[PDB]
């Protein structure tokens, strides 16, 4: 194996969550192993998402993880681990464009959509994030929305208080079931769309801004 | 700039393509869909494509076959076998011909693969093609639909005629033809 095979490349690795693998009908990939092959070729391993390197995401299939959504949002190509396999085997970099992973399952099209070049799906979008999950929501979608081109994202804790939130400056409210009822009522009066995180996700999968109400799962209170 | 033309060109000899009729039975090796102008076939299995002409082209005429990706974002990409199947005619060509004086070409500037054979008169003349990778081959087509462009050229390589059809190399041609044909029916 050439010691400089992957030099110049940086990598993000991700495992399809169990629900990702679950939806089956709707050597196996090993993060540590692939990392070892990558390092052996001077590949730079990024433990988390961030000019001097060509970045690539490595996974064994399309998945719905923070790392996957971040790469969809930022243009970092999602490549199949097999590109690592074939490259080591041949000891020569293959064209990753022949190993691109699908973007994800589309609610609208009702099938797995392939990935194609797109324009930042949240361009100049000003959004208000409302939730009681100061980590798995406010922090998570904030970063994703921004690297996805948002003009700005105002984080607001559901259990916090409305003494500065001027709803009329926002284009959309991305929230979850913990959204205070006073915010839902105001949004309605101001005709400010309110949606769930699935709207954000679908925007990333589809590759463009889609219908605020194009699907029931977009309603903020969609449960199970 | 580089992507080969797929423009239908019947030319002076009235060049058209034809395909045998087959069912949509879950047990069919190669079936053609006139509706979608698409062929569904299994990996490495006889794919008969018919050459029809109004006037017999002069001896020395050749029939070239080349694949290109159907989607824009992928068209400038060279269609080839996945490294998996290459490790088992040159091994990197996706389209083969069973039968002749079949010549395989690797254009030294477009890097494009193509297979050509002497054109013979019929009434139509049939050429048997083979696709050596499934449309879903990771590392190869990778789920990207392709177009097979058939061109009629003279002894020197000048265009005399051109035609094309979409292809899907898969496990169940019949099953998939029906599905994609239904897919059509409504949005
Ligand atoms: Zn293959």
Curated annotation (Swiss-Prot), chain A:
Q: How is it modified after translation?
A: Asymmetrically dimethylated on Arg residues by PRMT1. Methylation is required for DNA binding.
| Superkingdom of origin | Eukaryota
**Taxonomically, what lineage is the organism?**
Eukaryota, Metazoa, Chordata, Craniata, Vertebrata
All residue ranges annotated as the BRCT domain in the record: 1-101, 117-217
List the disulfide bonds in this chain: none
What role does it play? Double-strand break (DSB) repair protein involved in response to DNA damage, telomere dynamics and class-switch recombination (CSR) during antibody genesis. Plays a key role in the repair of double-strand DNA breaks (DSBs) in response to DNA damage by promoting non-homologous end joining (NHEJ)-mediated repair of DSBs and specifically counteracting the function of the homologous recombination (HR) repair protein BRCA1. In response to DSBs, phosphorylation by ATM promotes interaction with RIF1 and dissociation from NUDT16L1/TIRR, leading to recruitment to DSBs sites.
Intact protein stretch covered? 1724 to 1971 of 1972
Query: Where is the chain membrane-spanning?
Result: none
Residues with the Phosphoserine modification: 36
Stated name of the protein: TP53-binding protein 1
The protein's assembly and partners: Homoligomer. Interacts with p53/TP53 (via the central domain). Interacts with DCLRE1C. Interacts with histone H2AX and this requires phosphorylation of H2AX on 'Ser-139'. Interacts with histone H4 that has been dimethylated at 'Lys-20' (H4K20me2). Has low affinity for histone H4 containing monomethylated 'Lys-20' (H4K20me1). Does not bind histone H4 containing unmethylated or trimethylated 'Lys-20' (H4K20me3). Has low affinity for histone H3 that has been dimethylated on 'Lys-79'. Has very low affinity for histone H3 that has been monomethylated on 'Lys-79' (in vitro).
The linked condition is: A chromosomal aberration involving TP53BP1 is found in a form of myeloproliferative disorder chronic with eosinophilia. Translocation t(5;15)(q33;q22) with PDGFRB creating a TP53BP1-PDGFRB fusion protein.
Q: Give the subcellular location.
A: Nucleus; Chromosome; Chromosome, Centromere, Kinetochore
Query: According to its record, what is known about the domains?
Result: The Tudor-like region mediates binding to histone H4 dimethylated at 'Lys-20' (H4K20me2). Interaction with NUDT16L1/TIRR masks the Tudor-like domain and prevents recruitment to chromatin.
Curated annotation (Swiss-Prot), chain B:
Query: What organism does the UniProt record list as the source?
Result: Homo sapiens (Human)
Recorded consequence of changing residue 95 to L: In a sporadic cancer; somatic mutation
| General function of this protein | Multifunctional transcription factor that induces cell cycle arrest, DNA repair or apoptosis upon binding to its target DNA sequence. Acts as a tumor suppressor in many tumor types; induces growth arrest or apoptosis depending on the physiological circumstances and cell type. Negatively regulates cell division by controlling expression of a set of genes required for this process. One of the activated genes is an inhibitor of cyclin-dependent kinases. Apoptosis induction seems to be mediated either by stimulation of BAX and FAS antigen expression, or by repression of Bcl-2 expression.
**Reported effect, residue 70 to M:** In sporadic cancers; somatic mutation
Q: What is the effect of changing residue 177 to P?
A: In sporadic cancers; somatic mutation
Q: What is the effect of changing residue 167 to A?
A: In a familial cancer not matching LFS; germline mutation and in sporadic cancers; somatic mutation
Explain what the record says happens when changing residue 145 to Q: In sporadic cancers; somatic mutation
Q: Which residues bind DNA?
A: 8-187
**Entry protein name:** Cellular tumor antigen p53
Phenotype upon changing residue 77 to Q = In a sporadic cancer; somatic mutation
Relate the outcome reported for changing residue 57 to H: In sporadic cancers; somatic mutation
């Amino acid at each position: 194996l050439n010691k400089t095979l992957f030099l110049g490349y940086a990598f993000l690795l991700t495992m399809a969550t169990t629900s990702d693998k679950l939806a089956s009908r709707s050597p196996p990939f090993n993060k540590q192993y692939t990392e070892s092959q990558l390092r052996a070729g001077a590949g730079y391993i990024l433990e988390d998402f961030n000019t001097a390197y060509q970045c690539l995401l490595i996974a064994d299939q399309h998945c719905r993880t923070r790392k996957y959504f971040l790469c969809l949002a930022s243009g970092i190509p999602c490549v199949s681990h097999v590109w690592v396999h074939d490259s080591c085997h041949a000891n020569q970099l293959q064209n990753y464009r022949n190993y691109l992973l699908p973007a994800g399952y589309s609610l609208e099209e009702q099938r797995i959509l392939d990935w194609q070049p797109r324009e930042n799906p949240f361009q100049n979008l000003k959004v208000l994030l409302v939730s009681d999950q100061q980590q798995n929501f406010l922090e998570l979608w904030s970063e994703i929305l921004m690297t996805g081109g948002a003009a700005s994202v105002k984080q607001h804790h559901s259990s916090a208080h409305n003494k500065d939130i001027a709803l009329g400056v926002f284009d959309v409210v991305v929230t979850d079931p913990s959204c205070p009822a006073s915010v839902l009522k105001c949004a309605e009066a101001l005709q400010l769309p309110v949606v769930s995180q699935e709207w954000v996700i679908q925007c990333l999968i589809v590759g463009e801004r889609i219908g605020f109400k194009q699907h029931p799962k977009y309603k903020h209170d969609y449960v199970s | 700039s580089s992507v080969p033309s797929q423009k239908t060109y019947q030319g002076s000899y009235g060049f058209r393509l034809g395909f045998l009729h087959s069912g949509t039975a879950k047990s069919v090796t190669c079936t053609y869909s006139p509706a979608l102008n698409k062929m569904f076939c299994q990996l490495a299995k006889t794919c008969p494509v018919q050459l029809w002409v109004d006037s017999t082209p002069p001896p020395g005429t050749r029939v070239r076959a080349m694949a290109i990706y159907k989607q824009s974002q992928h068209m400038t990409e060279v269609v080839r076998r996945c490294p998996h199947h290459e490790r088992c005619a040159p091994p990197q060509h996706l389209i083969r011909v069973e039968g002749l004086r079949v010549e395989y070409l690797d254009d030294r500037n477009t890097f494009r693969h193509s297979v050509v054979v002497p054109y013979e008169p019929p009434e139509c003349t049939t050429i048997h093609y083979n696709y050596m990778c499934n449309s879903s081959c990771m590392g190869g087509m990778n789920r990207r639909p392709i177009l097979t462009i058939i061109t009629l050229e003279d002894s020197s390589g000048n265009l005399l005629g051109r035609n094309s059809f979409e292809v899907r190399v898969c496990a169940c041609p019949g099953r998939d033809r029906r599905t994609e044909e239904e897919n059509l029916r409504k949005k």
